[PDB]
Design a protein around this ligand. Structure first.
Ligand code: HEM
Ligand SMILES: CC[C@H]1OC(=O)[C@H](C)C(=O)[C@@H](C)[C@@H](O[C@H]2O[C@@H](C)C[C@@H](N(C)C)[C@H]2O)[C@@H](C)C[C@@H](C)C(=O)/C=C/[C@H]1C
Length: 396
């Protein structure tokens, strides 16, 4: 089916503000064939109700064996993860790490996350001119530092994830993203082998042991896929929640003032950051196992479907006055972390990081503000991730 719109042709204007386009589409129907800025042809599902339903609908699979579109060699190497599986494989894989990310288990990481944030912020505050780029100084370093310590990724090996992730989000090429994947995949395999038999206590070491104890519970391919998903799934997302959220807060002085006046509104503010400018613009690939009809529009089986969480969050019927960033707004039911069996397992960790980061910036940066007109900001064209290239800020 030919695309009705080529998102790439819309340019940076769409990347910066995609909402009007999604809403115009929603006004004419729930499903639309489009071409992403990358060149991929997929279906977009818009509207909160339809989005929510599709996310949990078992008729839409995440197993590539149900996609008419073949996986590339590199992707086929990291495909065996819970997010790209259906029950029972998904059920088995998720159980292996579910207990690791509960709210109570994550709470024990507060002291260390707080140290990391205080460290990064104080380093940022060393700027002789009271200016810095929040992405480079805090948004990017925080999540990678936290997850690497949890998984056991050596400090020296983290710089490479900077370049690799930039390739995944913001290429320069189709090809390039694949190259980055092959590189990272190769690295993960070597990191896993370096753990085997070393008696480490980090999560990756424990997973390696789990795989060695029972290859049926976690195969070599699934072990590699687990390392991949735990590193990727929470990196780019958390990074952009922090940057996007602060951008939202700093571009709405009234909300900043409100949070300043009552820090107990912090948790609600982070939830509205997810609703208003969540990092996941469109969910990961879903494939109908059978032809599915959405309000008259039939999506053929095997086709690629992207649920546009960004649009669901701007649906008036569900979030009144959607264009307004209101930190005290009712956010119950948002889909920023997904919905259904694939609901984010790292949500408590992401919230811990964001809440601690947001508070530190507000309590230690006197007169914190954006140091650039918003029209000068550059947003990623990637269909799944909503994010900035940089976020220049200033303080007294
Ligand atoms: C602000 C940060 C985060 C956001 C907005 C986010 C969002 C999401 C979303 C939308 C999904 C579902 C995607 C879909 O259904 O297509 C998901 C799945 C997942 N996320 Fe997160 N995530 C974040 C942080 C994390 C962190 C910190 C971890 C690390 C533990 C993580 C690990 C995962 C995993 C493993 C899954 C797969 C769940 C499954 O398939 O059962 N996420 N996340
Ligand atoms: C928590 C949701 C994150 O998504 C994922 O973890 C999934 C499993 C993932 O890693 C893929 C969606 C990647 O997206 C793309 O990767 C390219 C190299 C190939 C491309 N292909 C389908 C055309 C597509 O799979 C992931 C590396 C994407 C980047 C931008 C990312 O970090 C997003 C993460 C969340 C959406």
């Amino acid at each position: 089916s030919p695309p009705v719109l080529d998102l790439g042709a819309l340019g940076q204007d769409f990347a910066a503000d995609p909402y009007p386009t999604y809403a115009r589409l929603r006004a004419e129907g729930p499903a639309h064939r489009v071409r992403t800025p990358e060149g991929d042809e997929v279906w977009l599902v818009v509207g909160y109700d339809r989005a929510r339903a599709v996310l949990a609908d078992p008729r839409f699979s995440k197993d590539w064996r149900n996609s008419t579109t073949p996986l590339t060699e590199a992707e086929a190497a990291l495909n065996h993860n819970m997010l790209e599986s259906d029950p029972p494989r998904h059920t088995r894989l998720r159980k292996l790490v579910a207990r690791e990310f509960t709210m109570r288990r994550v709470e024990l990481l507060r002291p260390r996350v707080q140290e990391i944030v205080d460290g990064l912020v104080d380093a940022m505050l060393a700027a002789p001119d009271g200016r810095a780029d929040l992405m480079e100084s805090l948004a990017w370093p925080l999540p990678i530092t936290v997850i690497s310590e949890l998984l056991g990724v050596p400090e020296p090996d983290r710089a490479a994830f900077r370049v690799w992730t930039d390739a995944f989000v913001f290429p320069d090429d189709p090809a390039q993203a694949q190259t980055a994947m092959a590189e990272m995949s190769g690295y993960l395999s070597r990191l896993i082998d370096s753990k085997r038999g070393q008696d480490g206590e980090d999560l990756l070491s424990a997973l390696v042991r789990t795989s060695d104890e029972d290859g049926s519970r976690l195969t070599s391919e699934e072990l590699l896929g687990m390392a991949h998903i735990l590193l990727v799934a929470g990196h780019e997302t958390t990074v952009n929640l922090i940057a996007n959220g602060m951008y939202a807060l700093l571009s709405h002085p009234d909300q900043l003032a409100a949070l300043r006046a009552d820090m107990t509104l912090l948790d609600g503010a982070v939830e509205e950051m997810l609703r208003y400018e969540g990092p996941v613009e469109s969910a990961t690939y879903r494939f109908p196992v059978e032809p599915v009809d959405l309000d008259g529009t039939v999506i053929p089986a095997g086709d690629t479907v992207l649920v546009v969480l960004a649009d669901a969050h701007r649906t008036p019927e569900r979030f009144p006055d959607p264009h307004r960033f209101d930190i005290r707004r009712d956010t119950a039911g948002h889909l920023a972390f997904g919905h259904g069996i694939h609901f984010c397992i790292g949500a408590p960790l992401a919230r811990l990081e964001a809440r601690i980061a947001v508070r530190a910036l507000l309590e230690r940066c006197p007169d914190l503000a954006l140091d650039v007109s918003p029209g000068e900001l550059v947003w990623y064209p990637n269909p799944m991730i909503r994010g900035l290239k940089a976020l220049p800020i200033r303080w007294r």
